[PDB]
Amino acid sequence: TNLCPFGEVFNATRFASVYAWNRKRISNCVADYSVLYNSASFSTFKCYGVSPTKLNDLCFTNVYADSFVIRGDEVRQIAPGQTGKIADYNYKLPDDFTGCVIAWNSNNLDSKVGGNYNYLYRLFRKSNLKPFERDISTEIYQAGSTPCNGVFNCYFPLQSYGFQPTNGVGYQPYRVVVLSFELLHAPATVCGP
Amino acid sequence: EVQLVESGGGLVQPGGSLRLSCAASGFTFSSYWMNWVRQAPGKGLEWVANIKQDGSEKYYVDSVKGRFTISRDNAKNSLFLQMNSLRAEDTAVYYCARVWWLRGSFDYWGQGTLVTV
Amino acid sequence: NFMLTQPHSVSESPGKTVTISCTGSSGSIASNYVQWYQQRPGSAPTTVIYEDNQRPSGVPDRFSGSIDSSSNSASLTISGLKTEDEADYYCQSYDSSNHVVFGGGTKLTV
Ligand SMILES: *[C@@H]1O[C@H](CO)[C@@H](O[C@@H]2O[C@H](CO)[C@@H](O[C@@H]3O[C@H](CO)[C@@H](O)[C@H](O)[C@@H]3O)[C@H](O)[C@H]2NC(C)=O)[C@H](O)[C@H]1NC(C)=O
């Protein structure tokens, strides 16, 4: 049996920053989801469109594993219909999103006493994002009416999360994996057992 | 048609022990999680213990750690709960319940075993 | 620790509607699924609503519900109360900090 590499997605040593979230395609494999919905390691596990008791035996053309690191307090923004700094400028899910949002506390992996500033998020943008878009430009953001000229009310659009082991839970890092599912006119390639 | 049949309750002295069990029929244990849910007289429900399909992993409410042990025999279609060092706090009816997946619903409940201290 | 709370006493005349809330505390109710149970006095609780807003076969369509992320709360509503709908209703959700959390329970009369 050719099993889908959910292990590799969830056990990755490094996750992308939310401003530049990663995407991996899962196809032409057997998707065993029993390893995801039967564990207590996740703090968040919520599916939209398809029930966890049904997706286990449904066939799809693609499963997209989108992954990133955000603050625990911002986990609630990773949902259809949501708004906020992450939902609007970093990672937008469509109102008709089908798939599962899975997240867990990674305070023992992604934070340091001296401050782990290697995880960035977009703080400013001229407008919000299209669902599943990605914007990794670093063009200086002009907040006011004064031209930035590439360099007051002009900001480097990204900011770091000061992730530290002593932060309270809402300020601890969370690893988020969003499995977006779709069925196209194309023949399905990803079936469960 | 599924049924959960509890037994092994009754009175128990403070500081003692009793083994509760819950026989099942109509379904296979290999496909379900089993849980115990406690209901003190006149109060709402609270969760006590959880065992997964293979018996390889167990969870408990923190308030019973070191006092309760959950186990299951897939061949005998019987769930067990061994509870030691009971206190007055522990008087309750104990329901066993079937859960399809960990974070999902408890879609079938037994009638409940009365345990008093 | 994450916990759910509920109104103790809820009631309304038959034929009218009722809302039974469940609010989160020191955690997000919307991060997991919310279940609702109905326990008639004298017997075991059964599922009425599960996975936020749906219901198992055997449950009439007068029982519905939703989760309001912005209020960190969830609720079920009953329309067209029947005198049959006399029970203690409970909300339930899962957390990693504390595995299964049941709400206090709402005593509903008609
Ligand atoms: C990511 O990698 C981890 C391993 O680092 C996978 O964890 C797996 O967790 C299960 C449940 O605890 C382990 O099963 C148990 O193993 C112990 C022995 O350590 C045994 O005594 C128990 O009876 C039970 O069999 C499983 O072994 C462990 N996997 C490995 C390779 O150790 C986790 O599942 C991976 N994530 C994903 C999405 O695959």
Domain ranges, ordered by start, for chain A: 1-114+165-193, 115-164
Give, as one character, the DSSP assignment of residue B15: T
Structural domain boundaries enclosing B12? 3-115
Minimal Cα–Cα distance from C91 to chain A, Å? 17
At position A3, the amino acid (one-letter code) is L
| Residue C36 vs residues A51, C17, C43: alpha-carbon distances, Å | 17, 17, 16
* B58 shares contact with chain A (CB less than 8 Å): no
- B70 CB-side CA count, 13 A: 25
A169 burial (CB, 10 Å; 0-12 / 13-18 / 19+) is middle
* A94 pocket-lining for ligand 1 (C-beta < 6 Å): no
- 8 Å CB contact of C99 and A40: yes
In this structure, how many other beta carbons lie within 10 angstroms of the beta carbon of residue B95? 23
**What's the CA-to-centroid distance between A35 and ligand 1, angstroms?**
9
**Residue whose C-alpha is closest to residue A178's, from A40, A65, A16:** A65
**Residue whose C-alpha is closest to residue B16's, from B65, B86, B70, B67:** B86
**Residue whose C-alpha is closest to residue B103's, from B59, B62, B56, B45:** B59
- From chain A, the residues in CB contact with C35 under 8 A are none
- Give dist(CA B12, CA C93) in Å, integer: 32
- Give dist(CA A111, CA A133) in Å, integer: 27
- Give dist(CA B35, CA B95) in Å, integer: 8
Reduced to 3 states (helix: H, G, I; strand: E, B; else coil), residue B63 is helix
Where do we find the tokens 């970093």? A90
Give the DSSP H/E element, type plus range, for residue A7. helix A6-10
Give the DSSP H/E element, type plus range, for residue A8. helix A6-10
Q: Which of A35, A175, A179 to mutate to test the pocket of ligand 1 (most atoms within 8 A of CB)?
A: A35
At position A77, the amino acid (one-letter code) is Q
User: How big is chain C, counted in residues?
Assistant: 110
End-to-end, the C-alpha distance of chain B in Å comes to 34
Domain ranges of chain C: 9-108
| Range C46-65 burial, b when 16+ CB lie within 10 A, else e | bbbbbbbeebeeebeeebbb
| Residue B95 vs residues A61, B79, B115: alpha-carbon distances, Å | 42, 11, 11
- The approach used to solve this structure was cryo-EM
Which ligand 1 atom is the nearest neighbour of the CA of B56? 23
Q: Which ranges of A11-164 would DSSP assign to H, the alpha helix?
A: 85-89
C30 → chain A, closest CA residue: A76
| Range A70-81 burial, b when 16+ CB lie within 10 A, else e | bbbbbbbbbbbe
Q: Which of A3, A4, A11 to mutate to test the pocket of ligand 1 (most atoms within 8 A of CB)?
A: A11
Contact A68, A134 (CB under 8 A): no
**What's the CA-to-centroid distance between A53 and ligand 1, angstroms?**
22
Architecture per CATH, domain C9-108, reads as: Sandwich (2.60)
- Give dist(CA A27, CA B36) in Å, integer: 39
Q: Structurally, how many domains does chain B consist of?
A: 1
- Give dist(CA B97, CA C1) in Å, integer: 24
**Residue whose C-alpha is closest to residue A88's, from A137, A140, A138, A130:** A130
CATH assignment at residue B28: 2.60.40.10
- From chain B, the residues in CB contact with A45 under 8 A are 103
End-to-end, the C-alpha distance of chain C in Å comes to 34
Chain centroid to CA C81: 15
